[PDB]
Structures are given as structure tokens and as C-alpha cells.
């Protein structure tokens, strides 16, 4: 049995994308499940895609680049369990549903770097024990759920720069034993002791990890709002 492409993928742009992928002539060409099972990468950055509906039927996709599109819903990605790379940078995600990543256990790189997120679901990244890079920069993040990063022990690179965080939960980074790069700058950190103790302590304890715009070791990069002074320079005392 075969089925036309735009029947499976309603979005014109994505249909054109899949057609391009399989070297077909027209979105009206029909395809066999064996042809669908051939797709292991999709490079669809900046293609005006508003919906990836139909992507559920590509079981073997490993490498998925959807950055710079107009996506607001990614529930169709749920069952793609072979996924190892997921680029969703500069799309239109205002909210992630719960358990959206619960299946994606093989993920090693996840970029959500410039969507318009405001909070994160509780335990959204917990099943991602293999993840090595997490980009959450330049969103509108207000606060982090407690122990949001607790499962991310392979993670080497965390990006939180340019958000709207004023405080992080105590001990939020403690389990990041493999962390080599973290970006904290351009947040209005509320350097009010005794609230800011853990973040000062942690930055100080791991000053080598904390990085600036140029990827250089720069533990002063995190700055108190109002003051504009380094977070780690704050001693909040007993």
C-alpha cells in the first residue's frame, strides 16, 4: 500500500520537506512504509513549517533540525524514540506539555534556545539521562521547577542566559557531575541574602564551569539586578 505525501503531512512546507528528503517529484507522489522507514535525518531549518503532523510515522528519525520555524506544538515528536538530536531553536513554543520528552531517552542534544517559554513542566527533562547539551537561553523563563536538572548527570553544557530568573531552587545544579559549561548571565538575579546563598556558594565552588558570551571562564558573569555586581561576591551570612 502507498499514500500521497500531503495526505500524511498536512503542512505544505513539511510535505515539501519530506518530498525533498525522499528525492520524489511531487507532494502528490505516494509512499510505502518502507520508504517512510528510510528517514533517519531531517534538516528542515527555516522552512516556514507550522506543523510537523505526520512525523509520527517516521519511526527511525535520529537527527531532527526544525529550528527557525513557526511550530507551537511538538506533541507529534513524542514517540520518536531513536531521536538523538532535536533542534527547535527560534520557534513559537509558549508551553511544553507534560511528559512530552518522556519517551526520548536516547536524546543527546536538545535546543529550545529562543522560543517564548515562561515556565517548565515539573520533571520535564527527567527521562533524558543521556543528554549532554541543553539550550534554554533567550526564552522568557520566570522560575525553574525544583530538581528540574536532577537527572541530567551526563549533561556537559547548560544554557540559561538571557532569561527572567531572579532565583534558582536550592541545590538545583548539584547533580550535574559532568558539567563543563554553564551560562547564567543576563538574568536579573535577586542577590538578597539569605536567598542568594546557594547560587553564590555554587558559582564559587565551581567557578571554572561558569562562562561568558565568549565561552571564557568568567564567574563574575552572573550579576545582581539593581547593583549589577557579581553574584558570587555576595556573602549571605548565617
Amino acid at each position: 500500500v502507498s499514500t500521497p505525501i500531503k495526505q500524511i503531512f498536512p503542512d505544505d512546507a513539511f510535505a515539501e520537506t519530506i518530498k525533498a528528503n525522499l528525492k520524489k517529484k511531487s507532494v502528490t507522489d505516494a509512499v510505502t512504509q518502507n520508504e517512510l522507514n528510510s528517514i533517519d535525518q531531517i534538516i528542515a531549518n527555516n522552512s516556514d513549517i507550522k506543523s510537523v503532523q505526520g512525523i509520527q510515522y517516521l519511526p527511525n528519525v535520529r537527527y531532527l533540525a526544525l529550528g527557525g520555524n513557526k511550530l507551537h506544538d511538538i506533541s507529534a515528536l513524542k514517540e520518536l524514540t531513536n531521536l538523538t538530536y532535536l533542534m527547535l531553536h527560534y520557534n513559537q513554543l509558549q508551553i511544553l506539555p507534560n511528559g512530552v520528552f518522556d519517551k526520548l531517552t536516547n536524546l543527546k542534544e536538545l535546543y529550545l534556545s529562543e522560543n517564548q517559554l515562561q515556565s517548565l513542566p515539573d520533571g520535564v527533562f527527567d527521562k533524558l539521562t543521556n543528554l549532554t547539551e541543553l539550550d534554554l537561553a533567550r526564552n522568557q523563563l520566570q522560575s525553574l521547577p525544583k530538581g528540574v536538572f536532577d537527572k541530567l548527570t551526563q549533561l556537559k553544557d547548560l544554557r540559561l542566559y538571557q532569561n527572567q530568573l531572579k532565583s534558582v531552587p536550592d541545590g538545583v545544579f548539584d547533580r550535574l557531575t559532568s558539567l563543563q559549561y554553564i551560562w547564567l548571565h543576563d538574568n536579573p538575579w535577586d542577590c538578597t541574602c539569605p536567598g542568594i546563598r546557594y547560587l553564590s556558594e555554587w558559582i564559587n565552588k565551581h567557578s571554572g564551569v561558569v562562562r561568558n558570551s565568549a565561552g571564557s571562564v568568567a564567574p563574575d558573569s552572573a550579576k545582581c539586578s539593581g547593583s549589577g555586581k557579581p553574584v558570587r561576591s555576595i556573602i549571605c551570612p548565617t
Binding site: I43, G67, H89, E109, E114, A137, Y161, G215
Partner: protein, 612 residues
């Protein structure tokens, strides 16, 4: 007939150490020598040295220089000809100068009994006061017409007495004492019937047009020496050409009777050292313009297409030991480089200058030196850059970064903390190993558009794109990929900044469509590349013009057709088999057909009546 060949020399007035070193150096070049392919330079030879070995010489291709010798005699008794390929002061084929010293002693004897012709060049004599007898020599017979204007014949002998030309010589012309030295004449002593030289005075004593010095008969194989080329005991305008035209196959064939030109000799295979040239010569080595490629079994010389590959060290290696960055000192050592065995660092010191190192500030313009680079073996690190430069202009020709070494053992490409607006690495097609970091470039847009995986040759590679310009800003300022670029990104806003073109590409530029119905020139498409259709094919108004690069691949031929090939003029005078010219004519339908064999000088129709 095939003689014994000597490379020659072009030292001019230089001396290789001791007079004895010089001499022994000279004797090693011309021992057992008959033909000299370069120039012959007899220099700084002193009295009582045996120049007996020079008698063997018979012809010289370049120029002859006899300078600064105090030896009594130079026995060039058998030199017959100077071709004059090369000139000494760009007028002179033969030059004899200042063979004298303050010891009051000098060169007396120069018996060129047999010097009979100089094809190109003039002569000069100055300050050979010991020398005599040569003043008698009449140079109308030896020299070409065109050159006698640039002759500088100052003869003065005061140093000694000389002998008089044995009366047997004609008009007292001798190269020295004895009738054996009388000047032989073969040009100005002949009836007007003879264009070439002569062996007697009559109009039957004429020689062939291809004889140079003189003759044993009128035939083409009777010359003493050839004007142009010698092909195994005959003299010829040109050697048999390597390519013949096959009129049944319509393409050029290699003729097995073809030969290459070694000096002035026609030879089937060039010598071993040697290489072939586009004109067909066999030559010592290909020009610094060029490199060697063995093609169809022959080692021909091909021209670079770009600066010839040159391999230079990167910073921290060899030349650049204990350096921290490409700086004002060392940036010049990268001139004409194609490939760097190592890493590049362009750091902020380079622009500031460093005084502890004694290093001055770097003039930005000089970064253009790096435009020649197409390969880096290690990493590329740029932490500093001119502030009024939009992109990385110096690296627009960089094709590959192999990353065998890596910054912090991680990054093979690090563009950090710059004011650029685009990367502009238009030519970059592979980053073999090592990661990528583009970080802290506040004005930089376009970076996240690139499908970096397309460049990666090792599977664990990753890209860090952090704190550059916001995509939202970059988008709103219209600094986005061109509409003609693929979804695979760009290095800037232009259609030549694309990584793959959306439809097709012309040059390095990208789409929108290749010239098929409309065309500045019409084109055809293969591998999504717009390719020009051949010139001799007439552009079709309702259909396509070409289906391929060649004149085979055209729909209508503009002018004439020869077999399959559409051609501007039909072959008329081209060489073929059995050493005969080929003549075609066009019929009324502009198809070109072969002429009657008898129509040797050409034709207008079939068989004669074609050939009246």
C-alpha cells in the same frame, strides 16, 4: 647526425671561486660537447690553460659569451651556428668582451673557421686588443639582415703584431693564420636564383630553404645544419604534429608518426629528465606558473588554476616557534600559501602590537595575504578582527579545516568576541574533526541557519552557537538567508553565501533558473549546475538549445555541420594521414563534405569541377 648535447650556462660575468675552480667547472660542462642547448659562456680562463675540449662544439642554441679571458687561444674551430634563442644584453647572439688584464697580456687567437650562420641576434666586440685577424671577417655572410643594425664592432689591436690573411683567402677574410682559417662564404657569393644559402656561385648551386650553414647538395637532406628542425637526416619547417585530424572519426587522433621538439630536433620520446609543453617541446621543467601531470602516458605541464599549492607552518611551529598570533612581523611569511600545517590564531595582541616581544601593530589590510589559504590542518581561532570589516574576508577561499589539533583539544573552529555581521566562509565545505564555537559576536547573524552537520566528517561533532545576535533581531533587520538559498543555511545575505542553492547554481551564485528558453547565453543543467551551451549552436526560440557542453550536443548548428559537430568554418588546410592536408567544402544545406583527393589546394564542390 644526432650529436652530443650540453646543457649550457647563464652565469654571465660571475666567477665560481678560484680561477681553477671556474676553469674546472667550465671543463666539466663542455667536455665531449657538440651541441649546447643553453648559452655558451667562456669566462675567466687564464694563460696556459688547455681549452682543447672546446673544439668539439658545432652548434649553440642560445648566445655565445667570451668574456674576461687572458688565455692566448680559444679553439672554437668547429662552431657552425648560433641560433640566438637567448640574447646576452638583449641584442647580442655573440659577445667577445674585455679578454685582457693589467698584466699587459691578452687573448690573441679565436679561430672560428666554421662559424657560418647566426639566425637571430647581433655581434659585439670591445676591448679585445690582443686579438687579431677577425677584423678581416665580413659579417654579411654570417648574420641575418634584420640584425646588422645592432652590431657593435670595435676592433683595436695595439698589444701585438698579428699575421696577415694568407692571400688565398677571399678579400683577405680569415679567422687566423693559414688557408685553413680563410673565411668560407655561402650567402653573399651566390646567384639571385637561390633564396637560401649556396655551395657554389651558380644558380644550380642553390641550397634548400631549410639549410642553415651550407650544403652538399640541393636536397632537403643535404644541409650541413638545419634552420628550424631536423627530423632524422632531413630538415623541416616543423616536426610532424602529434595530433592528426581523422575525417572518418571527425575527432583528432594521435598519429604514431608524430614527434616532440627537443631543442631543434624532432624526437619520438623526450629525454628522461624532461617534460612536454603545450606548444609541444620537450623541456627541463615546467614553469613556476605550472605543475606536472602525466596524461595519456606523457608527462605534460599544466597550469595551476590558482596559486600553486604551497605548504606553510601555522603559529607555534617552525618559522612561527613561540608565537602567540599572526602578527605584523610574521604575516608576510604566509604569502602565496595554500595550505597550513598547523593552527591559526588571530588574537587581540596582533592589532595592539606587543612591546615585550618587540612586535608592532598589525595593519588590517595585510590580512588579505590569507586570501590564498584553502586548507588548514589544525584549528582556526579568531578572537580579534578589524572593527569596520563586516565578515571574515581573509578566509573566503578556505575550503577545509581538518582539525587534527584542536583548541583546548575540542574546537577546530573558534570565532569569538567579534563585531562581524556575517562569517562569509563561502568556500568552506568540510570541517573533518573537532567542534565549532561561535560565541559572543553581538552583531553576528546567519550563524544558526547553517546545517553544520553537512560539514562534519566525524560523527560526535557538535556546534556551539551562543550569545550572538538574536534571531528575532536578525530576522527583523532583514539579515536573513537569501530567498534563493536552500534550507541548509548561508554565510551571509547574498545568493553566493548559500550552502546549497534552492533550485540551481550558475557560478558560485545560486538560482533562480538556468538559461533554457531565454539566455544571455543559453545553457543546460547537470547536477543542478547551469552550464553554458557551446558557442556554435544556434539558440532555439521555441525549444532548448543544448543537451551538453559540446558541439555534439546541440539542436541546431548556427553555421555548418561537420559530421556530428557544429562548426564555424569547415576544415580547410588541416593535416591528416600520409602527410597530406585535408580540404572540405560546405554544400547548399551547410553540411560539410570532403574534397577530391586531387583537389590539393582546396575546393568549392565535389570532385573537380570543384578543383579547377
Amino acid at each position: 647526425e644526432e650529436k652530443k648535447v650540453c646543457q649550457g650556462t647563464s652565469n654571465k660575468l660571475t666567477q665560481l671561486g678560484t680561477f681553477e675552480d671556474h676553469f674546472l667547472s667550465l671543463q666539466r660542462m663542455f667536455n665531449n660537447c657538440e651541441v649546447v642547448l643553453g648559452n655558451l659562456e667562456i669566462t675567466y680562463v687564464q694563460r696556459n690553460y688547455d681549452l682543447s675540449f672546446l673544439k668539439t662544439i658545432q652548434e649553440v642554441a642560445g648566445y655565445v659569451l667570451i668574456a674576461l679571458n687572458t688565455v692566448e687561444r680559444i679553439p672554437l674551430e668547429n662552431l657552425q651556428i648560433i641560433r640566438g634563442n637567448m640574447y646576452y644584453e638583449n641584442s647580442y647572439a655573440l659577445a667577445v668582451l674585455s679578454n685582457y688584464d693589467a698584466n699587459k697580456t691578452g687573448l690573441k687567437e679565436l679561430p672560428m673557421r666554421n662559424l657560418q650562420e647566426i639566425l637571430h641576434g647581433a655581434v659585439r666586440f670591445s676591448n679585445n686588443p690582443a686579438l687579431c685577424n677577425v677584423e678581416s671577417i665580413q659579417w654579411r655572410d654570417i648574420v641575418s639582415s634584420d640584425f646588422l643594425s645592432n652590431m657593435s664592432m670595435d676592433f683595436q689591436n695595439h698589444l701585438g703584431s698579428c699575421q696577415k690573411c694568407d692571400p688565398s683567402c677571399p678579400n683577405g677574410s680569415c679567422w687566423g693564420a693559414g688557408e685553413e682559417n680563410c673565411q668560407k662564404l655561402t650567402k653573399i657569393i651566390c646567384a639571385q636564383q637561390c633564396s637560401g644559402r649556396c655551395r657554389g656561385k651558380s644558380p644550380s648551386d642553390c641550397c634548400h630553404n631549410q639549410c642553415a650553414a651550407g650544403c652538399t647538395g640541393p636536397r632537403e637532406s643535404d644541409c650541413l645544419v638545419c634552420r628550424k628542425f631536423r627530423d632524422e637526416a632531413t630538415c623541416k619547417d616543423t616536426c610532424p604534429p602529434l595530433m592528426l585530424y581523422n575525417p572518418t572519426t571527425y575527432q583528432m587522433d594521435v598519429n604514431p608518426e608524430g614527434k616532440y621538439s627537443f631543442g631543434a630536433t624532432c624526437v619520438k620520446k623526450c629525454p628522461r629528465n624532461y617534460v612536454v609543453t603545450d606548444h609541444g617541446s620537450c623541456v627541463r621543467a615546467c614553469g613556476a606558473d605550472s605543475y606536472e601531470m602525466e596524461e595519456d602516458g606523457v608527462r605534460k605541464c599544466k597550469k595551476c588554476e590558482g596559486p600553486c599549492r604551497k605548504v606553510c607552518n601555522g603559529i607555534g611551529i617552525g618559522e612561527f616557534k613561540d608565537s602567540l598570533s599572526i602578527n605584523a612581523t610574521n604575516i608576510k611569511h604566509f604569502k602565496n600559501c595554500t595550505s597550513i600545517s598547523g593552527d591559526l590564531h588571530i588574537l587581540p595582541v596582533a592589532f595592539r602590537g606587543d612591546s615585550f616581544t618587540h612586535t608592532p601593530p598589525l595593519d588590517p589590510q595585510e590580512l588579505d595575504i590569507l586570501k590564498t589559504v584553502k586548507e588548514i590542518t589544525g584549528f582556526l581561532l579568531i578572537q580579534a578582527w578589524p572593527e569596520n570589516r563586516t565578515d571574515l574576508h581573509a578566509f573566503e577561499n578556505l575550503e577545509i579545516i581538518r582539525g587534527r589539533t584542536k583548541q583546548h583539544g575540542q574546537f577546530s573552529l573558534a570565532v569569538v568576541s567579534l563585531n562581524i555581521t556575517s562569517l562569509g566562509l563561502r568556500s568552506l565545505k568540510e570541517i573533518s574533526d573537532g567542534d565549532v564555537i561561535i560565541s559572543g559576536n553581538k552583531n553576528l547573524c546567519y550563524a544558526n541557519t547553517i546545517n553544520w552537520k553537512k560539514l562534519f566528517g566525524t560523527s560526535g561533532q557538535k556546534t556551539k552557537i551562543i550569545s550572538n545576535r538574536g534571531e528575532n533581531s536578525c530576522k527583523a533587520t532583514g539579515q536573513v538567508c537569501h530567498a534563493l538559498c536552500s534550507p541548509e543555511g548561508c554565510w551571509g545575505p547574498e545568493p553566493r553565501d548559500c550552502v546549497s542553492c534552492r533550485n540551481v547554481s550558475r557560478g558560485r551564485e545560486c538560482v533562480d533558473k538556468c538559461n533554457l528558453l531565454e539566455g544571455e547565453p543559453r545553457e543546460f543543467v547537470e547536477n543542478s549546475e547551469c552550464i553554458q551551451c557551446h558557442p556554435e549552436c544556434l539558440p532555439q526560440a521555441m525549444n532548448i538549445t543544448c543537451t551538453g557542453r559540446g558541439p555534439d550536443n546541440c539542436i541546431q548548428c548556427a553555421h555548418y555541420i561537420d559530421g556530428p559537430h557544429c562548426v564555424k568554418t569547415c576544415p580547410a588546410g588541416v593535416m591528416g594521414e600520409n602527410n597530406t592536408l585535408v580540404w572540405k567544402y560546405a554544400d547548399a544545406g551547410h553540411v560539410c563534405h570532403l574534397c577530391h583527393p586531387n583537389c590539393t589546394y582546396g575546393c568549392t564542390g565535389p570532385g573537380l569541377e570543384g578543383c579547377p
